[PDB]
């Protein structure tokens, strides 16, 4: 399996970016396999 990389851009902030998405506060736990899960 040929896994390879291709440059796609500079790392820059863009003043004209689209703005979206909410800001939820969630209780979570992180297990040994790197998996997040919700906690109550």
């Amino acid at each position: 399996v040929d896994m390879y990389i291709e440059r796609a851009g500079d790392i820059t902030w863009e003043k004209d970016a689209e703005v979206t998405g909410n800001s939820p506060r969630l209780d979570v736990a992180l297990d040994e396999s790197g998996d997040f899960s919700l906690v109550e």
């Binding site: 990389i5 440059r7 820059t12 800001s23 939820p24 790197g34």
Partner: protein
């Protein structure tokens, strides 16, 4: 070896993720490559450090990214979706509250091949990578940052 954001491709060809080149080190998420060596042109990039729990891996040297979300300001996801030009999505992170402290989280849901895309602060520094998270139907990604 040039600084930038890169697609991670596999062979037709498919985009399996994204990563960040900085200071000669390639940074991406463990679940994208599972640590496999990567081709860059005629060169080869070998893994250097990886951790399943953090879901991170670095190639050619140690993890270099150390900026962190300030807990108040909007950030930008520099999303590199399969088949699409790199594009910036600005958002105010929410919070993953954990027994070990709080982690910024972005409530943005892009295709899986976007995993490893960098999240940036206003100064253009990478505060973490996109693509390890939880579902609440809506996916929410931790802002996953390593240790330098």
């Amino acid at each position: 070896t040039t600084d930038g954001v890169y697609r991670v491709m596999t062979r037709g060809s498919t985009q399996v993720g994204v990563g960040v080149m900085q200071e000669g080190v390639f940074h991406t998420m463990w679940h994208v490559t599972k640590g496999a060596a990567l081709r860059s042109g005629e060169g080869r990039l070998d893994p250097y450090w990886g951790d399943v729990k953090q879901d991170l891996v670095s190639y050619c040297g140690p993890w270099k990214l150390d900026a962190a979300w300030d807990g108040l300001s909007e950030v930008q996801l520099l999303a590199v979706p399969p088949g699409e030009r790199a594009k910036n999505i600005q958002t105010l992170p929410g919070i993953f509250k954990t027994k070990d402290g709080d982690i910024g989280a972005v409530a943005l849901d892009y295709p899986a091949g976007t995993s490893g895309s960098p999240i940036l602060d206003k100064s253009g520094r990478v505060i973490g990578l996109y693509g390890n998270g939880v579902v609440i139907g809506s996916y929410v990604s931790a802002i996953t940052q390593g240790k330098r």
